[PDB]
Structure formats: C-alpha cells, structure tokens
Enzyme design. Structure first.
Site, PDB file in Angstrom:
ATOM      1  N   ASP A  59     -17.650   9.939  24.215  1.00 40.94           N
ATOM      2  CA  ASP A  59     -18.424   9.896  25.457  1.00 40.94           C
ATOM      3  C   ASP A  59     -19.919   9.786  25.098  1.00 40.94           C
ATOM      4  OD1 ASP A  59     -18.466  10.299  28.491  1.00 40.94           O
ATOM      5  OD2 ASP A  59     -20.056  11.660  27.726  1.00 40.94           O
ATOM      6  N   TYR A 106     -28.958   9.767  26.579  1.00 42.43           N
ATOM      7  CA  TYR A 106     -28.840  10.721  25.488  1.00 42.43           C
ATOM      8  C   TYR A 106     -29.684  10.308  24.283  1.00 42.43           C
ATOM      9  CZ  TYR A 106     -24.737  12.339  28.176  1.00 42.43           C
ATOM     10  OH  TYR A 106     -23.840  12.727  29.185  1.00 42.43           O
ATOM     11  N   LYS A 136     -22.618   5.179  30.182  1.00 41.87           N
ATOM     12  CA  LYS A 136     -23.047   5.451  31.536  1.00 41.87           C
ATOM     13  C   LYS A 136     -24.365   4.746  31.820  1.00 41.87           C
ATOM     14  CE  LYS A 136     -21.185  10.121  30.730  1.00 41.87           C
ATOM     15  NZ  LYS A 136     -21.735  10.427  29.390  1.00 41.87           N
ATOM     16  N   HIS A 169     -23.902   7.103  36.105  1.00 41.35           N
ATOM     17  CA  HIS A 169     -24.084   8.429  35.516  1.00 41.35           C
ATOM     18  C   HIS A 169     -24.289   9.510  36.571  1.00 41.35           C
ATOM     19  CE1 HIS A 169     -25.762  10.392  31.635  1.00 41.35           C
ATOM     20  NE2 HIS A 169     -25.182  11.332  32.385  1.00 41.35           N
TER      21      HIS A 169
HETATM   22  N1  LIG Z   1     -21.719  12.936  33.082  1.00 44.56           N
HETATM   23  C1  LIG Z   1     -22.654  13.892  32.989  1.00 44.56           C
HETATM   24  O1  LIG Z   1     -23.554  14.056  33.804  1.00 44.56           O
HETATM   25  C2  LIG Z   1     -22.552  14.827  31.814  1.00 44.56           C
HETATM   26  C3  LIG Z   1     -23.271  16.035  31.839  1.00 44.56           C
HETATM   27  C4  LIG Z   1     -23.066  16.975  30.818  1.00 44.56           C
HETATM   28  C5  LIG Z   1     -22.232  16.684  29.767  1.00 44.56           C
HETATM   29  N2  LIG Z   1     -21.614  15.430  29.698  1.00 44.56           N
HETATM   30  C6  LIG Z   1     -20.766  15.032  28.516  1.00 44.56           C
HETATM   31  O2  LIG Z   1     -19.910  16.124  28.241  1.00 44.56           O
HETATM   32  C7  LIG Z   1     -20.117  16.529  26.849  1.00 44.56           C
HETATM   33  C8  LIG Z   1     -19.746  17.970  26.666  1.00 44.56           C
HETATM   34  O3  LIG Z   1     -20.615  18.832  27.456  1.00 44.56           O
HETATM   35  P1  LIG Z   1     -21.874  19.610  26.844  1.00 44.56           P
HETATM   36  O4  LIG Z   1     -22.432  18.884  25.674  1.00 44.56           O
HETATM   37  O5  LIG Z   1     -22.761  19.891  28.009  1.00 44.56           O
HETATM   38  O6  LIG Z   1     -21.313  21.023  26.366  1.00 44.56           O
HETATM   39  P2  LIG Z   1     -19.939  21.671  25.797  1.00 44.56           P
HETATM   40  O7  LIG Z   1     -19.105  20.620  25.190  1.00 44.56           O
HETATM   41  O8  LIG Z   1     -19.403  22.527  26.891  1.00 44.56           O
HETATM   42  O9  LIG Z   1     -20.544  22.670  24.724  1.00 44.56           O
HETATM   43  C9  LIG Z   1     -21.200  22.140  23.549  1.00 44.56           C
HETATM   44  C10 LIG Z   1     -21.672  23.363  22.755  1.00 44.56           C
HETATM   45  O10 LIG Z   1     -20.545  24.117  22.310  1.00 44.56           O
HETATM   46  C11 LIG Z   1     -20.599  24.325  20.905  1.00 44.56           C
HETATM   47  N3  LIG Z   1     -19.272  24.320  20.376  1.00 44.56           N
HETATM   48  C12 LIG Z   1     -18.409  23.233  20.275  1.00 44.56           C
HETATM   49  N4  LIG Z   1     -17.244  23.522  19.764  1.00 44.56           N
HETATM   50  C13 LIG Z   1     -17.337  24.887  19.522  1.00 44.56           C
HETATM   51  C14 LIG Z   1     -16.369  25.735  18.968  1.00 44.56           C
HETATM   52  N5  LIG Z   1     -15.151  25.358  18.552  1.00 44.56           N
HETATM   53  N6  LIG Z   1     -16.775  27.066  18.820  1.00 44.56           N
HETATM   54  C15 LIG Z   1     -18.023  27.466  19.211  1.00 44.56           C
HETATM   55  N7  LIG Z   1     -18.974  26.673  19.770  1.00 44.56           N
HETATM   56  C16 LIG Z   1     -18.570  25.363  19.894  1.00 44.56           C
HETATM   57  C17 LIG Z   1     -21.478  23.206  20.371  1.00 44.56           C
HETATM   58  O11 LIG Z   1     -22.104  23.601  19.164  1.00 44.56           O
HETATM   59  P3  LIG Z   1     -22.348  22.617  17.900  1.00 44.56           P
HETATM   60  O12 LIG Z   1     -22.529  21.202  18.420  1.00 44.56           O
HETATM   61  O13 LIG Z   1     -23.575  23.257  17.272  1.00 44.56           O
HETATM   62  O14 LIG Z   1     -21.108  22.767  17.020  1.00 44.56           O
HETATM   63  C18 LIG Z   1     -22.513  23.015  21.508  1.00 44.56           C
HETATM   64  O15 LIG Z   1     -23.574  23.964  21.405  1.00 44.56           O
HETATM   65  C19 LIG Z   1     -21.566  16.131  26.601  1.00 44.56           C
HETATM   66  O16 LIG Z   1     -21.942  16.151  25.246  1.00 44.56           O
HETATM   67  C20 LIG Z   1     -21.596  14.747  27.282  1.00 44.56           C
HETATM   68  O17 LIG Z   1     -20.944  13.837  26.400  1.00 44.56           O
HETATM   69  C21 LIG Z   1     -21.747  14.523  30.723  1.00 44.56           C
HETATM   70  O1  LIG Z   2     -26.925  14.151  32.816  1.00 45.46           O
HETATM   71  C1  LIG Z   2     -26.304  14.433  31.739  1.00 45.46           C
HETATM   72  O2  LIG Z   2     -25.382  13.746  31.231  1.00 45.46           O
HETATM   73  C2  LIG Z   2     -26.669  15.716  30.999  1.00 45.46           C
HETATM   74  O3  LIG Z   2     -27.959  16.156  31.393  1.00 45.46           O
HETATM   75  C3  LIG Z   2     -29.053  15.408  30.994  1.00 45.46           C
HETATM   76  C4  LIG Z   2     -29.055  14.665  29.829  1.00 45.46           C
HETATM   77  C5  LIG Z   2     -30.236  14.010  29.469  1.00 45.46           C
HETATM   78  F1  LIG Z   2     -30.231  13.294  28.347  1.00 45.46           F
HETATM   79  C6  LIG Z   2     -31.402  14.118  30.209  1.00 45.46           C
HETATM   80  C7  LIG Z   2     -31.356  14.887  31.368  1.00 45.46           C
HETATM   81  C8  LIG Z   2     -30.189  15.498  31.770  1.00 45.46           C
HETATM   82  C9  LIG Z   2     -30.182  16.245  33.056  1.00 45.46           C
HETATM   83  S1  LIG Z   2     -31.421  17.102  33.404  1.00 45.46           S
HETATM   84  N1  LIG Z   2     -29.118  16.094  33.859  1.00 45.46           N
HETATM   85  C10 LIG Z   2     -29.065  16.707  35.172  1.00 45.46           C
HETATM   86  C11 LIG Z   2     -29.287  15.750  36.336  1.00 45.46           C
HETATM   87  C12 LIG Z   2     -29.726  14.429  36.181  1.00 45.46           C
HETATM   88  C13 LIG Z   2     -29.874  13.589  37.270  1.00 45.46           C
HETATM   89  C14 LIG Z   2     -29.593  14.077  38.555  1.00 45.46           C
HETATM   90 BR1  LIG Z   2     -29.705  12.995  40.089  1.00 45.46          BR
HETATM   91  C15 LIG Z   2     -29.180  15.387  38.734  1.00 45.46           C
HETATM   92  C16 LIG Z   2     -29.037  16.195  37.634  1.00 45.46           C
HETATM   93  F2  LIG Z   2     -28.620  17.458  37.812  1.00 45.46           F
END
Ligand SMILES: NC(=O)c1ccc[n+]([C@@H]2O[C@H](COP(=O)([O-])OP(=O)(O)OC[C@H]3O[C@@H](n4cnc5c(N)ncnc54)[C@H](OP(=O)(O)O)[C@@H]3O)[C@@H](O)[C@H]2O)c1
Ligand SMILES: O=C(O)COc1cc(F)ccc1C(=S)NCc1ccc(Br)cc1F
Ligand SMILES: [Br-]
EC number: 1.1.1.21
Length: 312
Positions: free
Chosen positions: A43, A48, A77, A110
């Site tokens: 993803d 990012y 995205k 996104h």
């Molecule tokens: N569509 C959107 O708006 C949106 C928004 C947010 C997220 N996303 C996607 O969803 C992905 C996942 O969400 P996220 O990055 O917010 O957070 P997450 O996956 O809930 O948590 C990531 C954190 O958990 C830690 N971690 C991972 N595996 C672990 C394990 N086995 N034990 C302990 N800690 C562990 C990582 O540490 P380390 O990396 O240091 O190991 C990192 O600090 C994102 O990276 C992105 O690709 C999309």
């Molecule tokens: O967005 C991600 O994937 C993870 O988050 C982010 C990832 C980035 F690389 C930069 C900003 C964000 C933020 S601040 N995201 C929240 C956000 C953005 C836009 C709108 Br509309 C509402 C909202 F809540």
C-alpha cells in the site's frame, strides 16, 4: 484463503505492507524483506513521499525474479491537490514512474476532499484552513474511470469515504465502474460496523488501515489509548500463543477485510505475516469488537470545514 475477489474480477491479497511514515532510507529494505517473506500487496501513496524508494524494491525483486508482476498487487492513491480533470492522469503517471510500474492493481481517491492544485499538499489560507477545490467526487470518479480505460490501473476505488459519499458514487449518473475498495481506518477502538456492513452489502471490499492504532502517527500523545499495550488484547494473544500485533492483524482478516499493517523493522515484517495458521473464535471476535470507543487516529482539524470532510 490468502486473496479476496474484487468486483473487477481480480484477486487482492488480504494482507499487505503499509508504507506511510516508512523512512526513505529504510523502506527499500522493508519492501524487499516483505516480498522475500511472502507479502504480495504493498500500500503506497504519492503523499507519503517515498514511492521512488518503494519502487526500487519492487523493481529489484521483479528483476531478481523473486516474484512475477502478475503476482504482485500494488496500490496507490490520488492526492487531494490532483482532483481536477486535467491533473488525474499525470498524478497517476508520476506514481507509476516512481514505482517503476506500467500499471497499478488498484488506484484510490485518497480522501473525498479536493484541494487547490499547486506544490503544497495542504494549501492553507492565512487563517490555517485548507483551501478547497471546486471539483466534486463524481467528476473525480469519472477521471478515475478513464485510467481503467487507458490501461494505467486495473481497479479503482475510494478511501475515507463515509456512507453518504460511497452512496453518491454508487448513484452517479452514468457510472461505468463501481469502486472496488473503500480503504478506511479500522481497529478494535474504531470498529466501523456500520460503514463496513454498508460497503460489503454493495460488493465493495473494505481495507482496514492503521490496524495497530498507528502508534508512530506524528500527532500521537503520551496518554492516548494503545492497542498494542491493551492488557485485554494481550490476554487473547497469549491464549493463542501469538503476539498482540498478530491478533490485531488476524481480527480484520476474519471480518472479510483486507489489512495493511506498516513496519520498517524486518523481524516485525516477518512476524506480521505469520497470521494464516491460527483462528480467533467467534467469542474472541465479539470481544475485540466490544472495545470500540469511536477513537479515530486519522483526522485533521485544518480540513474539518471542507464541504467533503468525511467525519462530520
Ligand atoms: N488511506 C488513508 O488515508 C491511510 C491513512 C493511514 C494509513 N494508511 C495506510 O495504512 C498503513 C498502516 O497504518 P499506519 O501506518 O497508520 O499504522 P499501523 O500499521 O497501525 O502501525 C504502524 C506502527 O506499528 C509498529 N509495528 C508494526 N508491527 C509491529 C509489531 N509486530 N509489534 C509492535 N509494533 C509494530 C510500527 O513500527 P516499526 O515500523 O518501527 O516496526 C509502526 O510504528 C499505512 O502505512 C498506510 O499504508 C492509509
Ligand atoms: O492520509 C494518510 O494516508 C495518512 O495521513 C497523512 C499522510 C501524509 F503523508 C500527510 C498527511 C496525512 C494526514 S494529516 N492525513 C489526514 C487527513 C488528510 C486529508 C483530509 Br481531507 C483529512 C485528513 F484527516
Ligand atoms: Br477529506
């Protein structure tokens, strides 16, 4: 069953690697390790700022013949400052160029909100509010459909769309392709039962982001809730001889969701993939659902007055 069938006819791996916050000097190794240990879904997003480095890893593993392109499922995205008819293709093309690909498996809107185009990802007015674009989610969807017809993407979908916004898409006059996926925040503290049932009822696959509660989110506060440290979840993990993270990843899988935990730590990348050899009971599942507190980690004050901000 490692893949779920999408409404475009393609199969999507239910476990992928997240890349938000993965440092550019660590993410190439992270993705290389992920592919070596079995991940087939990555993803990504232009916002990012690490797609070039993700792409180096993907390309090396394709060149090494560790994996075939057809076996990978690469998601990116469209960022908010590219919602405009004349900018969508170039935004997709930049992502493709960076990722070293000739198509994406899935390309998402996104966020539902469009912002003023320009260099800045979050253009602000002098008082700190995001500057909207006038382009709505229907015209942006038409632009996404063109990408399918041009061969740049195999599937299109949405992210952070609320029920009414999903419905808007589904009701679009002249809709050509339904969204394949809605990617939303989902974990035991934000269980999303209503939005998930709506999406699933319409044949839209839900992807759960931040399944571990995003403990590395930049706006985390020391006294915020912590899934990984919740003793109740630790107890379910111990009962199953698994880690808390493994429970938190298996949970959405058993709800028929796709899940995309992020890590740059090689041992945890491997750990997180070892979730196909145990089952949470129905009682475990209901117990985890009971922890909902409508606690949303991904939200943003500067965007809350945009007409399409989803969490009002
Ligand atoms: N569509 C959107 O708006 C949106 C928004 C947010 C997220 N996303 C996607 O969803 C992905 C996942 O969400 P996220 O990055 O917010 O957070 P997450 O996956 O809930 O948590 C990531 C954190 O958990 C830690 N971690 C991972 N595996 C672990 C394990 N086995 N034990 C302990 N800690 C562990 C990582 O540490 P380390 O990396 O240091 O190991 C990192 O600090 C994102 O990276 C992105 O690709 C999309
Ligand atoms: O967005 C991600 O994937 C993870 O988050 C982010 C990832 C980035 F690389 C930069 C900003 C964000 C933020 S601040 N995201 C929240 C956000 C953005 C836009 C709108 Br509309 C509402 C909202 F809540
Ligand atoms: Br938004």
């Amino acid at each position: 069953a490692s893949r779920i069938l999408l409404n475009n006819g393609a199969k999507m791996p239910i476990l992928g690697l997240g890349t938000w916050k993965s440092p550019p000097g660590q993410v190439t190794e992270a993705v290389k390790v992920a592919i070596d240990v079995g991940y087939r879904h990555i993803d990504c997003a232009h916002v990012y700022q690490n797609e070039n480095e993700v792409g180096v890893a993907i390309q090396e593993k394709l060149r090494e013949q560790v994996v075939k392109r057809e076996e990978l499922f690469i998601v990116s995205k469209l960022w908010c400052t590219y919602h405009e008819k004349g900018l969508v293709k170039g935004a997709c093309q930049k992502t493709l160029s960076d990722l070293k690909l000739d198509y994406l498996d899935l390309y998402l809107i996104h966020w539902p909100a469009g912002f003023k185009p320009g260099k800045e990802f979050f253009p602000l007015d002098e008082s700190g509010n995001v500057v909207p674009s006038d382009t709505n989610i229907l015209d942006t969807w038409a632009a996404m459909e063109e990408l399918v017809d041009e061969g740049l993407v195999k599937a299109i979908g949405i992210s952070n769309f609320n029920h009414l916004q999903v419905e808007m898409i589904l009701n679009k006059p002249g809709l050509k392709y339904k969204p394949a996926v809605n990617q939303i925040e989902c974990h035991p503290y934000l269980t999303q039962e209503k939005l998930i049932q709506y999406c699933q009822s319409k044949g839209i696959v839900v992807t759960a982001y931040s399944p571990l509660g995003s403990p590395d989110r930049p706006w985390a506060k020391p006294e915020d809730p912590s899934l990984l440290e919740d003793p109740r979840i630790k107890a379910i993990a111990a009962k199953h001889n698994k880690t808390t993270a493994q429970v938190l990843i298996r949970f959405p899988m058993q709800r028929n969701l796709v899940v995309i935990p992020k890590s740059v730590t090689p041992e945890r990348i491997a750990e997180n993939f070892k979730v196909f050899d145990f089952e949470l009971s129905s009682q475990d599942m209901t117990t985890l659902l009971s922890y909902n507190r409508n606690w949303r980690v991904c939200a943003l004050l500067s965007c809350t007055s945009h007409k399409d901000y989803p969490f009002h």
